[PDB]
Amino acid sequence: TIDEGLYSRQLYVLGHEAMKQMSQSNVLIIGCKGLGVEIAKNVCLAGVKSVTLYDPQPTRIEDLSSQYFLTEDDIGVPRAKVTVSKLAELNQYVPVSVVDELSTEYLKNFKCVVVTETSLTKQLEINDFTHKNHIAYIAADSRGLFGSIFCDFGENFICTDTDGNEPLTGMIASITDDGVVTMLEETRHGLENGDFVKFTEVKGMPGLNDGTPRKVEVKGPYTFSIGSVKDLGSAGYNGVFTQVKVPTKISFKSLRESLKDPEYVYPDFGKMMRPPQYHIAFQALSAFADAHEGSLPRPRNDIDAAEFFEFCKKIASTLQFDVELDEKLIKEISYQARGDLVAMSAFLGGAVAQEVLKATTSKFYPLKQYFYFDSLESLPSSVTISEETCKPRGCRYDGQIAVFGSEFQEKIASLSTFLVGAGAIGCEMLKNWAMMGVATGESGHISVTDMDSIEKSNLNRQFLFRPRDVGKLKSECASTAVSIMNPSLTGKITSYQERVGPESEGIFGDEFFEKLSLVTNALDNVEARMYVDRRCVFFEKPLLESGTLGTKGNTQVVVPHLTESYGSSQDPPEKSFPICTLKNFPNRIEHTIAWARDLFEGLFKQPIDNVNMYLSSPNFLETSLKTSSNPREVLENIRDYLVTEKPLSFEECIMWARLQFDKFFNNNIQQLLFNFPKDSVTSTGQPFWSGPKRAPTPLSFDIHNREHFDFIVAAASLYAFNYGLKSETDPAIYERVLAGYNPPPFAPKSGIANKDKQELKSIADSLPPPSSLVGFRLTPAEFEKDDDSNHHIDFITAASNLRAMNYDITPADRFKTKFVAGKIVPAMCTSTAVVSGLVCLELVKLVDGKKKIEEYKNGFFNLAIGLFTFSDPIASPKMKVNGKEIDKIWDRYNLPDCTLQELIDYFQKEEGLEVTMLSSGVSLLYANFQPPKKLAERLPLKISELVEQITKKKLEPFRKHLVLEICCDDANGEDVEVPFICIKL
Amino acid sequence: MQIFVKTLTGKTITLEVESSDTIDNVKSKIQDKEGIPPDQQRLIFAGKQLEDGRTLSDYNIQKESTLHLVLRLRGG
Amino acid sequence: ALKRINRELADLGKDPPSSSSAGPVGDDLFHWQATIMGPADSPYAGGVFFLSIHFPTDYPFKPPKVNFTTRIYHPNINSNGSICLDILRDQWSPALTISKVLLSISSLLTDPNPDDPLVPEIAHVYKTDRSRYELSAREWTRKYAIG
Numbered sequence A: 001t002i003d004e005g006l007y008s009r010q011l012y013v014l015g016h017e018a019m020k021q022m023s024q025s026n027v028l029i030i031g032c033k034g035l036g037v038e039i040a041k042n043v044c045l046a047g048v049k050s051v052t053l054y055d056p057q058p059t060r061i062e063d064l065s066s067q068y069f070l071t072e073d074d075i076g077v078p079r080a081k082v083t084v085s086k087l088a089e090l091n092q093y094v095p096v097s098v099v100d101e102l103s104t105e106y107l108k109n110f111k112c113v114v115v116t117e118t119s120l121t122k123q124l125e126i127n128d129f130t131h132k133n134h135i136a137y138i139a140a141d142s143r144g145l146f147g148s149i150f151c152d153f154g155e156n157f158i159c160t161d162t163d164g165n166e167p168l169t170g171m172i173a174s175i176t177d178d179g180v181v182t183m184l185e186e187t188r189h190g191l192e193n194g195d196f197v198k199f200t201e202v203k204g205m206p207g208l209n210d211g212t213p214r215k216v217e218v219k220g221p222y223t224f225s226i227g228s229v230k231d232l233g234s235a236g237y238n239g240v241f242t243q244v245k246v247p248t249k250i251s252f253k254s255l256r257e258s259l260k261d262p263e264y265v266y267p268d269f270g271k272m273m274r275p276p277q278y279h280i281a282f283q284a285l286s287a288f289a290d291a292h293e294g295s296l297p298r299p300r301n302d303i304d305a306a307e308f309f310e311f312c313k314k315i316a317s318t319l320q321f322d323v324e325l326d327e328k329l330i331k332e333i334s335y336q337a338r339g340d341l342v343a344m345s346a347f348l349g350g351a352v353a354q355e356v357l358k359a360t361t362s363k364f365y366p367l368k369q370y371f372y373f374d375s376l377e378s379l380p381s382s383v384t385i386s387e388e389t390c391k392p393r394g395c396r397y398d399g400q401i402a403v404f405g406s407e408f409q410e411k412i413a414s415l416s417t418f419l420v421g422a423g424a425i426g427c428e429m430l431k432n433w434a435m436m437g438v439a440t441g442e443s444g445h446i447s448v449t450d451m452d453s454i455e456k457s458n459l460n461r462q463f464l465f466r467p468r469d470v471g472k473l474k475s476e477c478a479s480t481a482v483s484i485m486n487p488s489l490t491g492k493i494t495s496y497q498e499r500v501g502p503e504s505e506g507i508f509g510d511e512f513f514e515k516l517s518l519v520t521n522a523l524d525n526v527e528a529r530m531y532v533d534r535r536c537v538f539f540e541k542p543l544l545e546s547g548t549l550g551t552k553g554n555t556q557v558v559v560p561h562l563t564e565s566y567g568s569s570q571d572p573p574e575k576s577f578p579i580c581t582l583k584n585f586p587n588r589i590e591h592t593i594a595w596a597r598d599l600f601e602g603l604f605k606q607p608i609d610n611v612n613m614y615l616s617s618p619n620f621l622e623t624s625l626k627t628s629s630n631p632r633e634v635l636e637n638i639r640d641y642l643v644t645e646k647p648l649s650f651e652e653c654i655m656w657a658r659l660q661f662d663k664f665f666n667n668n669i670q671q672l673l674f675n676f677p678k679d680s681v682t683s684t685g686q687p688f689w690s691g692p693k694r695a696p697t698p699l700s701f702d703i704h705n706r707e708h709f710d711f712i713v714a715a716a717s718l719y720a721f722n723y724g725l726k727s728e729t730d731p732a733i734y735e736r737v738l739a740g741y742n743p744p745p746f747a748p749k750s751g752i753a754n755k756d757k758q759e760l761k762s763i764a765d766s767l768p769p770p771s772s773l774v775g776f777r778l779t780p781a782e783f784e785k786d787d788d789s790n791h792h793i794d795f796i797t798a799a800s801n802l803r804a805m806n807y808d809i810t811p812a813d814r815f816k817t818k819f820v821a822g823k824i825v826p827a828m829c830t831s832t833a834v835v836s837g838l839v840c841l842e843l844v845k846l847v848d849g850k851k852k853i854e855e856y857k858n859g860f861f862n863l864a865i866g867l868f869t870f871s872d873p874i875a876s877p878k879m880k881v882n883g884k885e886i887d888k889i890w891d892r893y894n895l896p897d898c899t900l901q902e903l904i905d906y907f908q909k910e911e912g913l914e915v916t917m918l919s920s921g922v923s924l925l926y927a928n929f930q931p932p933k934k935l936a937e938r939l940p941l942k943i944s945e946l947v948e949q950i951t952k953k954k955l956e957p958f959r960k961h962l963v964l965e966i967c968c969d970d971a972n973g974e975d976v977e978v979p980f981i982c983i984k985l
Numbered sequence B: 001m002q003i004f005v006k007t008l009t010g011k012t013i014t015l016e017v018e019s020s021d022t023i024d025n026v027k028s029k030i031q032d033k034e035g036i037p038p039d040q041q042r043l044i045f046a047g048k049q050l051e052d053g054r055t056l057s058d059y060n061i062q063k064e065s066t067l068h069l070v071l072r073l074r075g076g
Numbered sequence C: 001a002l003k004r005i006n007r008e009l010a011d012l013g014k015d016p017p018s019s020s021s022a023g024p025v026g027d028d029l030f031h032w033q034a035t036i037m038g039p040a041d042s043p044y045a046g047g048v049f050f051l052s053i054h055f056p057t058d059y060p061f062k063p064p065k066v067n068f069t070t071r072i073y074h075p076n077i078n079s080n081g082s083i084c085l086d087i088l089r090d091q092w093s094p095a096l097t098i099s100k101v102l103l104s105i106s107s108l109l110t111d112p113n114p115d116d117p118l119v120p121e122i123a124h125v126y127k128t129d130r131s132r133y134e135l136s137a138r139e140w141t142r143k144y145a146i147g
């Protein structure tokens, strides 16, 4: 009963049972500051049964540093009472409540308890109760640039899914007498030692098909071992194995027992000695607060730091820790005690919300148990950080000033950023910028660009968009929401509706890009990422890239003249199946879905487009005859979809749907089995339809059967939409009209000087002249998700399921078909929060203008396994040109608009290189192998004139430069790699 | 010497390498055991991303060391 | 991709392929027109087959789109010219030159593979009646691949 129209992306990550368990769980959240509100927001978007808040402390102005549901008019009101109203709107299925007083026995109503902004004594009191009563307990702290998480899910936690991966499966080729399972040719099972698998469709050893899991002993990338199957048989052939995932029992320790001997999770292996330091430091913070009426050390105060370090020494001695305290790091913890950063709050809130979901659903591997994190490399070094500049000024940025100071605040307030994309990461980035105070100065500005509009499936992971905003532009709504959050941004945000690509360079040109300070990508495709990366490299602007996939995420930073660009490294490409497999011999649901998508394209969008374009182009046939490989197909398509089969009513549309059903699910199979009978053998004597090739079976239509009727309805509706008729969904008309259809007989055919050209000419002239039809157009069917409710996904599902039944493949429902055909990316709110936090932690490094490559961190994480990794960016490579050091990425030649001969002589005279090839855009301007006449024609022309001549298109008025790629070889004949040329028009 | 490589999806790979092996040899071994082309592999040790052309001894990779094999993601 | 394309073109120029000759069209680098001569010891002897090559924007990180332009009677080549080659769909790596692709296509013409066909009709004819396949291939090459 889960709302698939809103939780569509989250179901691809969690599942149905997981969310069913999630929607029956109660979460209590103690503390309603930035970390608490972030956790509550993520939990509400996730979809737990309800959330209860407890925070009777009156609101203070500094709390606005990371609390984005508080406003200056709420000062003096309890934080829970002012936050519940805003939280209640995020999700309508998750009630949010407030309790004005807490008691121990009252904790039994909740599935999970999250604790923030609480002293250690209260935490011990709460945990002593929750542990023995088997309630999950999570405690999170955020002190400046330091963070801590502690999880305790009970003494007998049961985890049903550990890594979160899809179960592995594969096709076997032989199982010997000793259980040595061998995969097919050059196919990898991917299993690991200690796994369990179950077999099916094994011939020769039917016993293995029962389904009892067996231990796997991986002996190689292609073969493994399951044990001894002597009794079950002698040898088995073919079959399919599938992994079985078993529950695990994780045992946690209470907080009181865990303090003595903690178990750490390491977010960075480059600093493995720190978490033991933070363990003492946070306890010392608690003791210091208890000794000063709950007052933390003041910002950059040395007396408080000394007292805090004395407490640290006392605690370390008491706990018999054989750890030498690093004075600098601990005193750094002391200085930033009152810090409250929105980036750290976002990071820790995402992590803690994921832990809450793990506690409620019993999936993924929880943190066990202490997770201490720090981003101390972000502390500014180009400004003054002292007790004088870090003192509060009675403003909403006190939390950030306590860590960075007022001068860095002035630096932040005058940023001119450019954000590409306004989806989930875009909304998180805008919220973080609004809270941090980005672009609130007299010289600041923010630019957002996004060409899409708000839909219903975007609200869940995008918390700035409400159901009343459906249909508006994403950028406008995001800008208005963040201007409400921080009123100082009124007038400092400009929103466009332009796709960032080669066709929008007139808007985001030289003038636009010269004023920026940095660019942040929030995209979902690689082509746009590469384009924005190239633009940033040309204009030399810092770039912040980030991406997510389910529970996984990564963030990267590109710094001019320091690191390599985004496009300097490769990523795995999308899998494309062989045409032979898709067309004739599929063996997976993905193959059938790809075939169905191709059928849709070639049956509802290719013919209509061809017909429409024929009526407009007067010389289409002239080029089609000599250019296209098979003009016969084009001519037949035009004829069939223009004159031969023009419908007027819907009965003929249903008849056409039935005809296509026979064509694609009954006749092609018969032809294939006529060519390759079921008992045929390959050239080597082995059976043909064995292994990856499944013998098909023709489908005979049956109106009562759900799949056939669904296909008929979808195809008829799509055809009607093509021809603009009034479709119907009443089954009575379908039943009436399908019963009067007599299929034409079909029998497979065995086959058996310029006639063909004359035949094609006769067919061509037989068509009506272009002047016959003027103003007549037909609407091709486009692909979407219920936006154009032409049964697109339903048609593809029916076609794929019918073709699966042709080859006895297991069909997939509409959910998986939508996932595969639509190429949907699984999305999570927690991953988005974590990546936004990491990106905003790198942004302060960029603002400070750090110059060393060891001070930046590219981040990777997987929240399903609790894995975090950080690595320095790769430095851009260097090269030698004319005995000079040249950067291979961030260096270019700046030349005037000179004649081609002058450019060649310049390269021959200054760089000592001979120019061999010179190209601009997609055109070859000059090459050494061209005939002398052509060059002599092209030598005395300017570069701009040459480009205009070759491309046959005048340069636009807004064009202010040209980028040229040049390949030149040295005097000795050795080819030399040189940077690109920047011609100034 | 024997090293462990942990993927971003939790899988563990055990490699038999010498301290003098180049990163190219390690990437070739990972390709043999996983099928990932060397140009698409991102290896991390102690906060440093291993680059082609250097040896393990440059990064102080000793026995029982743990590397991380990561990749970039396209959602957003 | 321009630099990679030009380097491959120059490499072709320095050492002639003899049996093949690929080069751009007009002054465009993302569109080539290749030519192949059928093996002497094959039914396609004395034939000239033209191919169209479209380099994607991401070359060499995406395979080139190679399609036959003439009419050839082959089990692994259909009427649209699509070629059934593993290195063009999912086995492509950024280390294969167009010369390797042309050598692979010539080898494919040398010996067809009817075990995993793309055109079941021609594969069935090849498996059943070899002489008829030979005659049909010769007629097709002399009617479409000569001139």
Ligand SMILES: *P(=O)(O)OC[C@H]1O[C@@H](n2cnc3c(N)ncnc32)[C@H](O)[C@@H]1O
Pocket (backbone or CB within 6 Å): A420, A421, A422, A423, A424, A425, A449, A450, A451, A452, A474, A498, A499, A500, A501, A522, A523, A524, A525, A528, B075, B076
């Ligand atoms: P996620 O899928 O949740 O959101 C992605 C957002 O990025 C925007 N976007 C994608 N591609 C482009 C280009 N080329 N230019 C501008 N914006 C882009 C989508 O509109 C989503 O808002």
